[PDB]
Amino acid sequence: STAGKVIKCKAAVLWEEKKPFSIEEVEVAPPKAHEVRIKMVATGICRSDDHVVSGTLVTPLPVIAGHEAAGIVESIGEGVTTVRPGDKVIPLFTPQCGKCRVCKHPEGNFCLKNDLSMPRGTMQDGTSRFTCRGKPIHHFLGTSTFSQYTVVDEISVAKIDAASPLEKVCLIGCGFSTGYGSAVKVAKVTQGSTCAVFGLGGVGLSVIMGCKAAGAARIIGVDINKDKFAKAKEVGATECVNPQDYKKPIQEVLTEMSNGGVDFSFEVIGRLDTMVTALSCCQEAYGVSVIVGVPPDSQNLSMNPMLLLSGRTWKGAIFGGFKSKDSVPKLVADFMAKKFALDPLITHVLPFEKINEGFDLLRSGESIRTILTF
Amino acid sequence: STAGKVIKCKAAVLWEEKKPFSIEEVEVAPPKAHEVRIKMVATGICRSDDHVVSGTLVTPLPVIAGHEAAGIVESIGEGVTTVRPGDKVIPLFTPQCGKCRVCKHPEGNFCLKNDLSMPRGTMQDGTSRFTCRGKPIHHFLGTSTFSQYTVVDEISVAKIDAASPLEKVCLIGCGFSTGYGSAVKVAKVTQGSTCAVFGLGGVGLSVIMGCKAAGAARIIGVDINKDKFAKAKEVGATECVNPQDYKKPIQEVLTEMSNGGVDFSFEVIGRLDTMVTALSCCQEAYGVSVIVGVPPDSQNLSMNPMLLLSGRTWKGAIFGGFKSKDSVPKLVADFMAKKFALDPLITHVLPFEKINEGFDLLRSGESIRTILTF
Ligand SMILES: NC(=O)c1ccc[n+]([C@@H]2O[C@H](COP(=O)([O-])OP(=O)([O-])OC[C@H]3O[C@@H](n4cnc5c(N)[nH+]cnc54)[C@H](O)[C@@H]3O)[C@@H](O)[C@H]2O)c1
Ligand SMILES: NC(=O)c1ccc[n+]([C@@H]2O[C@H](COP(=O)([O-])OP(=O)([O-])OC[C@H]3O[C@@H](n4cnc5c(N)[nH+]cnc54)[C@H](O)[C@@H]3O)[C@@H](O)[C@H]2O)c1
Ligand SMILES: OCc1c(F)c(F)c(F)c(F)c1F
Ligand SMILES: OCc1c(F)c(F)c(F)c(F)c1F
Ligand SMILES: [Zn+2]
Ligand SMILES: [Zn+2]
Ligand SMILES: [Zn+2]
Ligand SMILES: [Zn+2]
């Protein structure tokens, strides 16, 4: 009934940094060639969405944020072959064009069509599908999931199992897949190893899940909010430490606890100082540290390269290193087969209309993931 | 006969930074339990030795430096089982104790018994075997090869082929093995890949050799001294670039040349700025950059962690990642079997008495390796 027509719907528009989202009517254009218009069903609140609010992440405003979601295809533009109306889908904030040198590489996932490195806030064609109060509104990461309807490029959507519970599998669109893949694919955590995970939010919990799945013998959670420790232990942490409890810097504490440094460490917060701490705490000759947290815009860290010269490996990744369109349907299939759990990440459920309360819950430290339902 | 006796011999003593070596008589104590006294045959001049002179590397003075060498066992202490008098040997500036967590790790080589991190300038027992003009003289990296005779711990010496030409295979004690291993073992250069090598001295040329042995399709040498380019091309560089020739930063030049970034880059100079450039010039999603150079003591670099978040891997290594005592004899056997060449690294051969002249050749840009002969 809406194919080829502008849809008026509600969205959460961010007009200004450091302000509440405005739930109000937007106009969503129909999909152009190789575009897909999706009726959203569920979207998670990831800390990266909050970064847009805080200005930690710089992207053009005004914007419709949201990148962790699942929905149902309402219509497809000309030439779309990989989804159809009625299919369940997850938007892909890291696209998979399948054609660029990264998509062709066996270990690349950061497709060159991404809108993360130097955000334009548009569709692939450099234009917007969103109007609000007669003004064009930016997209975010090609996804813009804080809307009852969004339009995405075909390279930014994956078809998933028709029997998927969308209020759970939305987390495969960011936080679960990122954390789990950062452990199993990026770090390649080994059986019997010792891991340290800095930050015990939805992504860090997912890192612990992966480290446990990989067979780590010790998984040390690190957070300044000790209310995060119980859930971290439930999903596999063997012990948790709060840096505020110690006179000494936590890299020295973790090096002592691990009899000379950990095998694998993960920065899952977004602070320059914890990125250097996390590198330092892995064993100097053969340790690996993975940056997962999003750093504040345009700020440089300072570090002594002797940390690397001794043998450490330092790497980072977007979306757990997963090639997004290949991996998301497989991850949903594995979830359907109970290969991993998503419920431990979901602490709150709210209607979309209570998005601001959802952000309040994240900022207070109370929530892991709030799932918004449309 | 010298066994069990103090030897009076010639050595190059560094009494203070930024002064010439003093070629004079030292006394060399006999080896204690688990120690080996070696008559030196040949030693190379590595830039790391010059870093001790310049203050780039801090190590206790006065000192007998030198770490790239080969010689013949004069005598062994009680309990030595791995060499005998008359054996050809290479001292190991990275030891292999065989017992520490690093030595037991499949990918570790930076043995915890090393004297690099926190140099004491002693034998493993915290004492010195050297005196000069009645004063105790420090060891350097457990090796101290700028002497007619040295004493090393057993864990810091490898027995090599009795038919080895010691005036060539001394380079397996540092520069060849470091560069070659940085490419083949630490980076794991792939067939058909594009490499960039920053610094075309003895170590950087050995990195080129390894990149070519690994089947790289393109190997771009980078040096501010264009006199270094002809030999770089002889051993496998396909292109050479001088940053001073460009209005743009060389990371931009190399990204353009490689149609979006190199597969593998190597910092083989010792400058903070080139370490960040080398990381930047590798492809942002799947590139690997290896730090080989040694920069000025206690200086931090500045970098934007977004370089890592996109997917880059940044690592460093000592001695090409090789477990020293297992690897050095195999590298010498492979040299004897013509699997690689060492002559391209050797530009000058001088008597040991001309050590200062050999350092002046390095500092002036003329030489790659000077081999000093005893
Ligand atoms: N690389 C990616 O693809 C990717 C994906 C998803 C999220 N992110 C980022 O990952 C980070 C974590 O996201 P999330 O789990 O949704 O966030 P979150 O739920 O806010 O969790 C962060 C955790 O860090 C804790 N923390 C804060 N400061 C410190 C400190 N100084 N020391 C130790 N713990 C501290 C904090 O208490 C909280 O539990 C954010 O920076 C995201 O932007 C990156
Ligand atoms: N990691 C290890 O185990 C290890 C082993 C051996 C050597 N090293 C270090 O590796 C480095 C190279 O040693 P080497 O090959 O004996 O030294 P070298 O022979 O002096 O070569 C260094 C090269 O760098 C070139 N260079 C200098 N500045 C620049 C610049 N700004 N841009 C590009 N090129 C430049 C210079 O012209 C020269 O050709 C030194 O810092 C050594 O201390 C490390
Ligand atoms: O949470 C996933 C996520 C990221 F990892 C980013 F690096 C980023 F810029 C962003 F906008 C994002 F949403
Ligand atoms: O050239 C090898 C070498 C190094 F790689 C160092 F890191 C160091 F401190 C040193 F003294 C040395 F000789
Ligand atoms: Zn692509
Ligand atoms: Zn996210
Ligand atoms: Zn050891
Ligand atoms: Zn050296």
Side-chain angles (χ1 to χ4, degrees):
Chain A
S1 63
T2 53
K5 303 184 179 146
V6 173
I7 288 175
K8 290 180 177 176
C9 70
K10 297 315 185 285
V13 176
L14 187 73
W15 293 105
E16 193 187 353
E17 290 183 28
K18 301 187 181 164
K19 296 297 176 90
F21 296 95
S22 177
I23 294 278
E24 63 178 290
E25 178 169 276
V26 301
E27 299 176 85
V28 184
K32 300 189 181 214
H34 299 102
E35 304 172 0
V36 178
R37 185 158 62 179
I38 305 170
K39 179 180 173 187
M40 299 317 309
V41 172
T43 187
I45 294 173
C46 174
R47 178 65 66 168
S48 301
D49 299 300
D50 185 60
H51 290 337
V52 174
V53 183
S54 68
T56 291
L57 264 174
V58 177
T59 197
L61 308 175
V63 67
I64 299 174
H67 63 286
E68 182 178 83
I72 297 168
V73 178
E74 168 274 345
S75 66
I76 60 172
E78 300 198 332
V80 168
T81 64
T82 62
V83 303
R84 294 180 292 196
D87 287 346
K88 289 180 173 172
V89 289
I90 291 176
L92 312 174
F93 78 82
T94 303
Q96 186 176 354
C97 78
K99 298 178 164 49
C100 76
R101 200 168 66 172
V102 175
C103 288
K104 297 184 168 284
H105 190 282
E107 313 298 320
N109 79 326
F110 191 55
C111 174
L112 289 165
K113 300 288 198 177
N114 80 80
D115 193 44
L116 275 76
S117 280
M118 281 190 50
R120 298 185 285 173
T122 65
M123 296 292 293
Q124 286 297 326
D125 72 3
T127 72
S128 170
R129 297 285 166 285
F130 296 121
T131 309
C132 184
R133 310 182 187 191
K135 300 176 183 192
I137 310 298
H138 289 101
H139 296 247
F140 179 54
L141 311 182
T143 60
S144 289
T145 72
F146 294 167
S147 183
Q148 288 171 331
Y149 290 83
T150 189
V151 181
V152 303
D153 291 285
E154 185 175 18
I155 63 167
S156 293
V157 64
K159 180 178 174 188
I160 64 164
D161 182 347
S164 299
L166 296 193
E167 80 287 0
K168 313 290 194 180
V169 300
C170 53
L171 290 182
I172 291 164
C174 182
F176 173 75
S177 303
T178 294
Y180 193 86
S182 293
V184 308
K185 187 170 182 73
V186 181
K188 303 164 192 72
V189 169
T190 54
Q191 183 155 17
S193 65
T194 293
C195 296
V197 182
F198 292 71
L200 304 176
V203 186
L205 292 172
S206 298
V207 173
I208 291 170
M209 289 172 177
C211 287
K212 178 173 183 178
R218 292 179 65 188
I219 303 164
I220 304 163
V222 184
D223 204 301
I224 59 169
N225 181 355
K226 72 179 190 303
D227 299 338
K228 298 291 170 179
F229 292 172
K231 180 60 61 66
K233 288 178 167 178
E234 283 173 26
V235 299
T238 54
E239 61 220 278
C240 289
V241 297
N242 178 351
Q244 301 174 335
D245 289 349
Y246 293 86
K247 297 181 187 189
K248 284 169 171 170
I250 200 71
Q251 62 196 38
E252 188 179 356
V253 174
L254 289 164
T255 295
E256 183 271 341
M257 284 172 71
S258 58
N259 298 293
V262 302
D263 296 289
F264 305 93
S265 65
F266 303 86
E267 198 283 5
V268 207
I269 304 160
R271 299 173 57 84
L272 300 182
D273 57 4
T274 47
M275 291 169 189
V276 180
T277 288
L279 175 66
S280 298
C281 84
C282 76
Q283 199 291 322
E284 65 178 358
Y286 56 75
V288 174
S289 188
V290 182
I291 303 180
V292 186
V294 160
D297 182 72
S298 300
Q299 302 194 28
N300 283 9
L301 62 76
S302 170
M303 62 80 71
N304 187 327
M306 286 298 324
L307 290 176
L308 297 175
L309 195 69
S310 51
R312 294 185 179 82
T313 300
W314 204 14
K315 73 203 296 187
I318 303 295
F319 197 57
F322 285 116
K323 291 180 183 286
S324 59
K325 192 156 179 161
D326 290 344
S327 303
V328 162
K330 175 60 160 153
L331 288 160
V332 169
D334 288 351
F335 173 69
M336 292 305 287
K338 295 201 85 190
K339 302 305 189 187
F340 57 87
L342 295 174
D343 286 349
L345 303 182
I346 301 168
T347 55
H348 299 81
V349 295
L350 288 171
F352 176 59
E353 292 74 24
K354 292 184 169 103
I355 185 161
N356 288 309
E357 168 180 356
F359 280 76
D360 295 339
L361 286 163
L362 178 70
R363 296 168 181 146
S364 72
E366 186 175 331
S367 59
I368 299 296
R369 286 295 202 262
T370 296
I371 307 305
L372 303 177
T373 293
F374 293 92
Chain B
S1 96
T2 54
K5 302 187 191 162
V6 173
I7 289 175
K8 287 185 186 163
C9 70
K10 198 177 298 185
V13 175
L14 186 70
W15 295 97
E16 88 183 76
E17 67 162 11
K18 298 185 190 199
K19 301 289 187 169
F21 295 98
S22 182
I23 302 272
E24 63 181 292
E25 181 168 74
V26 303
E27 311 80 44
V28 187
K32 300 198 182 210
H34 294 108
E35 304 178 352
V36 178
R37 185 157 65 177
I38 305 167
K39 185 175 185 190
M40 214 73 50
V41 171
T43 185
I45 296 170
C46 172
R47 178 64 70 166
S48 299
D49 303 298
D50 182 62
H51 291 336
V52 174
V53 182
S54 73
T56 287
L57 272 175
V58 175
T59 199
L61 306 180
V63 70
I64 297 176
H67 63 288
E68 179 179 86
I72 299 171
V73 177
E74 171 271 345
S75 66
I76 65 171
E78 182 173 15
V80 168
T81 62
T82 62
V83 301
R84 297 188 174 85
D87 283 349
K88 288 182 173 171
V89 287
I90 290 174
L92 309 175
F93 79 79
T94 303
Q96 186 177 354
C97 77
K99 292 180 183 160
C100 74
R101 209 168 57 173
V102 176
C103 285
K104 294 182 159 171
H105 188 288
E107 306 301 322
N109 76 327
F110 190 52
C111 173
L112 290 167
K113 300 290 198 169
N114 81 79
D115 199 38
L116 282 72
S117 294
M118 301 199 59
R120 296 187 283 170
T122 65
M123 299 295 294
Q124 285 296 322
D125 77 357
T127 71
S128 168
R129 301 283 165 283
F130 296 124
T131 54
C132 186
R133 307 189 203 175
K135 303 183 201 154
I137 312 295
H138 292 96
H139 296 245
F140 178 57
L141 311 180
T143 60
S144 287
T145 70
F146 296 165
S147 183
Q148 292 176 330
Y149 291 84
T150 191
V151 181
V152 302
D153 290 282
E154 185 175 21
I155 65 164
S156 297
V157 65
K159 183 185 179 181
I160 65 166
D161 186 326
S164 306
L166 294 191
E167 83 281 2
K168 301 190 179 317
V169 298
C170 53
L171 291 188
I172 292 166
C174 182
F176 172 79
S177 303
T178 296
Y180 192 83
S182 293
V184 311
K185 186 162 177 64
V186 179
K188 302 166 195 75
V189 172
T190 54
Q191 186 161 5
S193 65
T194 292
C195 297
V197 180
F198 290 77
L200 303 176
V203 187
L205 295 170
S206 298
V207 173
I208 293 172
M209 290 177 177
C211 290
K212 178 176 165 164
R218 293 180 63 187
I219 303 166
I220 306 165
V222 185
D223 204 301
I224 59 170
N225 183 353
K226 68 172 186 184
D227 290 345
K228 298 299 178 170
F229 293 173
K231 179 60 63 65
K233 288 180 171 187
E234 287 178 20
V235 302
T238 53
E239 294 170 292
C240 293
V241 299
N242 183 343
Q244 296 174 338
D245 291 344
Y246 294 88
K247 301 187 187 180
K248 297 192 159 129
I250 198 70
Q251 60 194 43
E252 290 175 20
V253 171
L254 290 163
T255 298
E256 179 275 335
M257 284 175 69
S258 65
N259 297 296
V262 303
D263 297 288
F264 304 94
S265 64
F266 301 86
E267 201 281 6
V268 207
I269 305 159
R271 298 174 56 87
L272 300 180
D273 57 1
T274 47
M275 290 168 191
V276 178
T277 288
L279 173 66
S280 300
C281 82
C282 78
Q283 202 287 324
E284 65 180 351
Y286 58 72
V288 175
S289 188
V290 181
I291 304 182
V292 188
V294 168
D297 184 74
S298 296
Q299 301 196 24
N300 285 359
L301 64 76
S302 175
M303 61 82 70
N304 188 320
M306 287 300 313
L307 291 175
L308 297 176
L309 197 67
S310 49
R312 294 183 180 83
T313 303
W314 202 14
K315 66 201 304 183
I318 301 295
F319 197 55
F322 287 118
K323 291 179 178 289
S324 58
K325 189 156 182 161
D326 294 331
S327 300
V328 162
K330 289 182 184 169
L331 287 163
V332 169
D334 286 355
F335 174 68
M336 292 306 284
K338 312 288 183 163
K339 299 193 174 173
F340 56 86
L342 294 170
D343 286 350
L345 303 180
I346 300 169
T347 55
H348 297 80
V349 182
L350 304 176
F352 172 61
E353 295 76 15
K354 291 187 192 298
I355 182 165
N356 288 310
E357 295 84 345
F359 276 80
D360 294 334
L361 286 164
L362 182 66
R363 292 172 188 138
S364 72
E366 178 169 338
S367 58
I368 301 294
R369 287 294 201 261
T370 296
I371 308 306
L372 298 179
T373 56
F374 291 89

